[PDB]
């Protein structure tokens, strides 16, 4: 049974202390996850052939990037000087995967 390459895309845990960069708030330690690794697929770039006007885009390319596949929204609550409470929002990455560079994730909701 072979262990796999450790340098591949996978998740890592780390701790950080959250503080507001302006308000005098009470800092707070939080457990976070990140993604990092070398995706297995090579990245490519090929020329495209045009018969029309010189192409605005002369290449077709593929490139895989280690990125969150699933995550979970989480809120944090900070206690600040005036007894005013300040809430911090972030995403806790659950799993990581290799996906295409140009692909993205929309935030805008649809009617």
């Amino acid at each position: 049974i072979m262990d796999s390459d450790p340098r591949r895309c996978m998740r890592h845990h780390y701790v950080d202390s959250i503080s507001h960069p302006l308000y005098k708030c009470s800092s707070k330690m939080v457990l976070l996850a990140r993604c990092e690794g070398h995706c297995s697929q090579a990245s490519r770039s090929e020329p495209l052939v045009s018969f029309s006007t010189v192409l605005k885009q002369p290449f077709r390319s593929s490139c895989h990037c280690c990125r969150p596949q699933t995550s979970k929204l989480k809120a944090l609550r900070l206690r600040c000087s005036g007894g005013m409470r300040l809430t911090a929002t972030y995403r806790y990455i659950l799993s990581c995967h290799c996906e295409e560079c140009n692909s993205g994730t929309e935030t805008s909701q649809v009617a």
Binding site: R8, M10, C39, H97
Partner: peptide, 7 residues
């Protein structure tokens, strides 16, 4: 598409 989902 390359692994982690946490108690």
């Amino acid at each position: 598409x390359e692994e982690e989902e946490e108690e």
